Amino acid sequence: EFDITVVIPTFKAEKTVGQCLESVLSQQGVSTEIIVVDGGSPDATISIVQSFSSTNLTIISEPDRGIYDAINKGVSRAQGGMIGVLGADDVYKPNVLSVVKENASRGVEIVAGLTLIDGQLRADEQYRPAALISGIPFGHNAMFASQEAYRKVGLYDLAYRICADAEWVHRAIKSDISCRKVEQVFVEFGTESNPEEIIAEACSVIQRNFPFLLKEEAKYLLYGVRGWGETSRIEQILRKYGHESVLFVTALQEAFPA
């Protein structure tokens, strides 16, 4: 079979899909499956992907309902023990896939690494209940999840077009999926959405973790942890809902130590 499966969603990615695939095919010490899920690109995207044409490259090209819909197609078709997602304008760093296989050999379900964005490290958080009241704890492209992890968590929720990665990881946390965080850069993200749109999805994700929360309550927790608002009502929300979930108590204790 394969150690790794790399799912690459693409739509009009002729500028960079080459560099993307180069960073995957040069990975040493691993048998890797590449699944390019194209959304019906009208440009030279498909012909560039076919230029490589390795025996381990599968090309899907058809209209889809978004990045996460295309991801879901690739994940379902993956045959490698560990599955990563790489944007066509991202690149893995050298030796990353071998590190993923190394950690996967010891039984870890999720292997996540650091993320380089415009020459700076992504400000990652911890894979822990506190993440449930914030965003995705690490860069999504820096994440690798085993077949078993996906079988037990499921696919990405297409109702979330921006924060579906955070919503999947929060479910992985809620599912008690093991995670190893590697303090090394896995991915170099490419920088070339309306804030309210993201804030709306983030709050909705938080409510999906803790349905007993209203919109403003989730937003107040979001703004409180993110530093955009005051944290005077944090104690009221713990008492108001503490009895509902120990996870919610744990998430608040980790996030707001005072």
Total site size for ligand 5GP, rule CB under 6 A: 15
Answer yes or no whether residue 66 interacts with ligand 5GP by CB under 6 A. Answer: yes
Answer yes or no whether residue 18 interacts with ligand 5GP by CB under 6 A. Answer: no
The count of residues in the chain is 258
Return the residue of 21, 30, 48, 64 that touches ligand 5GP, per CB under 6 A. 64
Q: How far is the CB of 79 from ligand 5GP (least distance, A)?
A: 20
Closest to ligand 5GP by CB, 136 vs 177, is 136
Closest to ligand 5GP by CB, 75 vs 108, is 75
- Give the span between the Cα atoms of 255 and 219, in whole angstroms: 15
- Give the span between the Cα atoms of 58 and 73, in whole angstroms: 12
Answer yes or no whether residue 4 interacts with ligand 5GP by CB under 6 A. Answer: no
Return the residue of 3, 38, 109, 167 that touches ligand 5GP, per CB under 6 A. 38
Q: Calculate the alpha carbon distances from 237 to 5, 95, 210, 234 in Å.
A: 42, 45, 12, 5
- Give the span between the Cα atoms of 180 and 11, in whole angstroms: 31
Return the residue of 14, 25, 58, 190 that touches ligand 5GP, per CB under 6 A. 190
Q: Where are the alpha helices (DSSP H) in the chain?
A: 17-25, 45-52, 67-77, 96-104, 147-153, 164-174, 195-209, 215-226, 234-241, 246-255
Answer yes or no whether residue 67 interacts with ligand 5GP by CB under 6 A. Answer: yes
Bridge partners, 83 (sequence order): 5, 145
Six token digits for residue 177: 């999926």
Residues 56/32, Cβ–Cβ less than 8 Å? yes
Closest to ligand 5GP by CB, 160 vs 248, is 160
Q: How far is the CB of 140 from ligand 5GP (least distance, A)?
A: 10
Closest to ligand 5GP by CB, 18 vs 66, is 66
| Residues between 118 and 177 with contacts to ligand 5GP, criterion CB under 6 A | none
Residues near ligand 5GP (CB under 6 A): 9-11, 13, 37-39, 64, 66-67, 70, 87-89, 190
